[PDB]
Write a protein that binds this DNA or RNA. Structure first.
Ligand SMILES: [Mg+2]
Lengths: 378, 165, 367, 251
RNA sequence: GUGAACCGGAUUGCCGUCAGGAAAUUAGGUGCGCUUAGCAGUAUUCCCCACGCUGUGGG
């Protein structure tokens, strides 16, 4: 049975906040933090915000966290405005004299009219990461991983990517869970996917791993860091420092590169039906049989074929786009289409509105053409 | 690409009268004059029967007009954005260089039906600056896909690289 | 309700708007480059036209003291006018956009009084903020900002912002842009030493067919002009008459771009719908038709598709169409997109005014 | 059950959203720069507008001060390389040269609606939840930001909507990794909708969807594929189809 | 249900007045498309039906 699940994170923009934002300047981190994935998984299962602190957060906080960097983001900034044209809520309340009645006893006497409003404009700039990919591989109990995977198969609530406006563009439930001993082998097991054929590929793929305590004792290494993203409560938030190390993985020896597995550009269909293909000659012969080898305009025997429309070319040819006409009519309708730009639908000899033009063109052709130039091809 | 090469070879197989008849039809379509239509058909349509990727009627007609007017010799490696770029150095950087550059960069706003007179004056400044060689096959292959950005993206790039030398 | 005008015009080679370098203005719509004439140029040309000349009761300028001194015969009210202007908060002097007669008469009667500078400055600020009865102010709006860096802390400003009631987009070509360059040299009347070569200049120009778009909000036009109602309809008719018959005054002395359009579709909504996306595909001239007919045919196709698309029965729409002598039909094949094909501008004005209300053009020529 | 709305629209030269320096808002995608209209612009663009005002509504849908709003709006993104420009304007005296700037792009949008949270916030009401969903559909199909619209009268109308009822939220923004190059035999909107087509034709090979286009102008897919369940010709008919797929529901 | 949940950078603007690319150039010098061919005095006229051991009728 699998013991560790896999989550895939990708979007056009993402942000994962750090400890260095206690005001209107919101800065982001380089990688999705533990608290973000814990919150998303709580949303996917559908646990209440007041319930996460009661036997639900430490149960998953006992798991081991592992992140792999497929391609890192460009640090981007968006200017945000709050309360344009409106009046905001301010925090001051009048002093209630005696300090004995405070807190919840004071909140029972609160009224909607007791609050006061101020019209101003609150400006902020928020940082987002553009074009970033990550894999979250959480190692826990096989039953717990099964429950987590079943929950993320169909999330109860909607899910986002750190902020509510960052949408998923790849499935989070794309990777089936597996059984591996170490987080390194698990992060190396999930392959690396390409979008289109020619693009830069990172030769080194950084990974973020929790620092294993090893045996009893074993004080923290000098290259380990601290990170305040172990959530204990979510309303109001309570966060706890943790130990984080960094490892690297070179591509081409323990992670393979998958193929493109699709098409990027769209492009229009194929015009230019081939006139030497066997299906074309068979359909042309059958259409010459159907019309009894008579021209459609002037009723002289039929030698060539004109194409009414070019919806299908080469491989498929239903004999309803083809009509039988002779040489003069073919040349006349050919010269009627030199600068028309109608592409798909061509001239129909059955439709009477072209007949008077075609006959005048044929009169021109009989008036002007030199036979001896057509023969002796120079 | 095959089919082009035989089209350029059949263009070079032409004689005095055929070059003159395509010369008198400069600045026009084909459907008006019947001898031009017949000569172009006899020179082009077997290739379109045999090969599917033979040039379109408009591009082949335009290239036939330009070859009949200028009659450059076919040689690989003498393409237009190289000779432009080898020529641009011999001019004054203050006055004549933007003048030639504007006429060269005007091509990125015109269509194949509208690209006869700028090409006429560009090969005119070639013929004035004593050149005899030009890659017609490369020009036909880039005109057949002239409506794509990488084609004109490698157009002026060949130019910049020839000019910087 | 809203009044909407669509407009297809073709122009001669000219330069009706240029940038600082000296070339026609250009844009990128639908992946290709197109010629452009700025909207504000069109609003300025309509505002300073001869079919709008009855309707300028206001000024946008910074030479207010020239106007105050011009409201005098001999009395020296130049230094004190500028002075009270500088204590007002217009310090380069700020551009002030208000009515003519109000500031003229009131500055003449207030500046010439022997009162305090602070009180007279307060009165000048009040009469500047209150002089919002002007037609260009209602059409084009107004924003003024007292510079508090150099402003006296005694007096206070009031509300002055004006919401406009006309939305015009930039003129956009229906096809690809084809820029051109013209080389000129000046000559000497009398022979003499003469030049070595002759310094060659450069004049950039182009020609295009333009789709212009107009939108008129009647409720805001009424609300800006107080309780008046006839003046709103008269302004609407005058603006239509001017915009049909006014060109930008660019390099018109050597590039006479005096052409007039070949098709006007007028419409009535409750919500603004712009039909500029008919020309996302560039128009390629083929041997049969011309640029104008294909432009209005593509416009007709988009109009037909939108009319058969986003369409609510609870608020149906109608509209009339105009062309000179009815030569260019919108419904070229079978569709009757407009119900009242009109062959003259005057009857179109009358129909629009009658649809607004019980107004005749000769009746409202008094406000 | 989640109702997901896919949204392609073209827009005229204008400037709806700008930053502190005034620039058109811009994100990074696909190795190049992308034109951008904020999701917090479409919110307070659709919101507090007159057309949308047609248990209390507009609180369960979009929240205000543990409201748990059930509508999520994403950042609009261009389908080609951003091409900004700067306009030069002068002032008159009628008795100095500045600079303004603008951008033109075709944007893909994405709308998602949680049905269960909407029903839970309606205190068990169901016709009101579908009523608010329909109301948001008609608002979102006919709403623009009120930017520099007096000078750049940008009042364009959409060109295609596809609606999805998938199990988990997933966007199609990865279809526009390769920027769209305009060819002679097409335009920007057709190639954008084709790039949308050759990303829904996949995935299933590697759910259902209702599609609408105005008078069926630019049909989804360039073959006879069944990549969309039904192709419809009215906005009201598409809304009625969405309500019909939710259940027995009349508009 | 995540340093997370609630969240428009908005209002103002004519690039308008000034210009000859101009003076001067023969594309002229030489060439046969030439030797050949009854729409008729025959000995099977591509197919089908009918009647006798060639005569009607249809392609
Ligand atoms: Mg025939």
């Amino acid at each position: 049975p699998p013991n560790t699940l896999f989550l895939r994170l990708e979007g056009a923009l993402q942000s994962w906040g750090s400890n260095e934002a206690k005001f209107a300047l919101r800065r982001t981190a380089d990688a999705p933090t533990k608290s973000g994935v814990l919150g998303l998984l709580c949303a996917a299962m559908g646990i209440g915000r007041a319930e996460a602190a009661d036997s639900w957060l430490p149960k998953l906080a006992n798991l081991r966290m592992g992140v792999r960097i497929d391609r890192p983001g460009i640090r981007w900034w968006d200017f945000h405005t709050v309360g344009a044209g409106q009046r905001m809520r301010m925090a001051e309340l009048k002093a209630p004299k005696k300090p004995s009645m405070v807190g919840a006893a004071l909140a029972e006497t609160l009224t909607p009219s007791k609050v006061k409003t101020r019209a101003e404009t609150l400006l902020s700039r928020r940082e987002y990461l553009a074009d970033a990919s990550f894999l979250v591989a959480l190692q826990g109990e096989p039953e717990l991983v099964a429950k987590l995977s079943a929950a993320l198969a169909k999330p109860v609530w909607a899910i986002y990517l750190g902020r509510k406006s960052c949408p998923p563009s790849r499935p989070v439930c794309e990777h089936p869970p597996g059984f591996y001993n170490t987080l390194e082998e698990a992060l190396s097991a999930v392959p690396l996917q390409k979008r289109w054929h020619n693009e830069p590929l990172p030769q080194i793929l950084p990974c973020v791993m929790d620092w294993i305590p090893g045996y009893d004792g074993e004080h923290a290494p000098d290259d380990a860091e601290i990170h305040y993203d172990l959530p204990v409560s979510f309303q109001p938030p309570r966060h706890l420092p943790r130990f984080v190390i960094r490892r690297e993985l070179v591509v081409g020896e323990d992670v393979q590169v998958s193929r493109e597995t699709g098409t990027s550009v769209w492009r229009p269909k194929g015009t230019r039906a081939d006139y030497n293909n066997s299906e074309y000659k068979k359909v042309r012969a059958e259409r010459l049989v159907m019309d009894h080898a008579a021209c459609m305009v002037c009723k002289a025997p039929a030698t060539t074929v004109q194409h009414v429309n070019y919806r299908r070319a080469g491989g498929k040819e239903i004999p309803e786009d083809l009509r039988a006409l002779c040489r003069l009519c073919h040349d006349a309708c050919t010269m009627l289409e030199y600068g028309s730009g109608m592409t798909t639908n061509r001239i129909d000899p059955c439709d009477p509105i072209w007949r008077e033009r075609i006959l005048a063109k044929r009169k021109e052709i009989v008036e002007f053409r030199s036979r001896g130039q057509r023969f002796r091809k120079m | 690409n095959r089919g082009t090469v035989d089209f350029i070879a059949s263009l070079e197989n032409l004689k005095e009268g055929d070059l003159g008849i395509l010369r008198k039809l400069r600045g026009a379509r084909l459907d008006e004059k019947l001898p031009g239509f017949d000569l172009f058909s006899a020179l082009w349509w077997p290739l379109r029967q045999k090969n599917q990727r033979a040039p379109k009627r408009e591009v082949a007609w335009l290239i036939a007009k330009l070859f009949a007017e200028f009659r450059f010799e076919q040689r690989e490696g003498a393409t237009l954005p190289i000779l432009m770029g080898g020529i641009c150095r011999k001019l004054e950087p203050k006055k004549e260089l933007p003048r030639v550059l504007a006429r060269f960069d005007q091509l990125a706003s015109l269509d194949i039906m509208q690209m006869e007179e700028p090409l006429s004056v560009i090969m005119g400044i070639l013929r004035k600056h004593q050149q005899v060689c030009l890659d017609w096959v490369g020009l036909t292959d880039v005109l057949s896909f002239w409506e794509q950005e990488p084609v004109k993206r490698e157009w002026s790039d060949s130019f910049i690289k020839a000019y910087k030398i | 309700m809203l009044i909407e005008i669509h407009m297809i015009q073709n122009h001669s080679p000219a330069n009706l708007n240029r940038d600082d370098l000296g070339a026609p203005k250009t844009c990128y719509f639908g992946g290709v480059l197109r010629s452009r004439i700025s909207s504000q140029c069109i609003k300025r040309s309509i505002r300073t036209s001869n079919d709008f000349k009855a309707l300028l009761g206001g000024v946008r300028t910074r030479r207010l003291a020239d106007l105050i001194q011009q409201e005098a015969g001999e009395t020296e009210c130049w230094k004190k006018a500028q002075e009270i202007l500088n204590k007002c908060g217009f310090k380069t002097k700020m551009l002030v956009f208000m009515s003519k007669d109000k500031i003229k008469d009131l500055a003449r009667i207030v500046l010439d009084n022997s009162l305090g500078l602070t009180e007279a400055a307060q009165q000048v600020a009040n009469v500047i903020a209150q002089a919002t009865l002007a037609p260009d102010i209602a059409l084009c709006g107004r924003m003024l900002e007292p510079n508090d860096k150099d402003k006296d802390k005694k007096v206070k400003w009031s509300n002055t912002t004006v919401e406009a009631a006309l939305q015009v987009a930039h003129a956009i070509s229906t096809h690809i842009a084809r820029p051109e360059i013209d080389y000129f040299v000046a000559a000497d009347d009398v022979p003499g030493e003469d030049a070595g070569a002759g310094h060659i200049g450069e004049s950039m120009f182009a020609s295009a067919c333009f789709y212009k778009y107009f939108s008129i909000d009647w409720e805001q036009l009424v609300k800006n002009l107080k309780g008046d109602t006839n003046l709103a309809a008269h302004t609407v008719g005058a603006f239509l008459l001017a915009a049909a018959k006014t060109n930008p005054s660019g390099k018109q002395n050597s590039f006479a771009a005096h052409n007039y359009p070949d098709g006007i579709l007028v419409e009535f909504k409750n919500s603004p719908i712009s039909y500029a996306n008919a020309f996302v595909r560039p128009v390629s001239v083929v041997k049969e038709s011309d640029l104008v007919e294909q432009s209005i045919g593509q416009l007709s196709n988009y109009v037909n598709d939108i009319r058969l698309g986003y369409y609510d029965e609870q608020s149906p729409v109608i509209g009339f169409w105009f062309s000179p002598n009815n030569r260019y039909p919108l419904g070229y094949k079978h569709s009757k997109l407009a119900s009242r094909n009109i062959g003259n501008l005057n009857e179109l004005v009358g129909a629009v005014l009658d649809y607004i209300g019980g107004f005749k053009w000769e009746e409202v020529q008094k406000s």
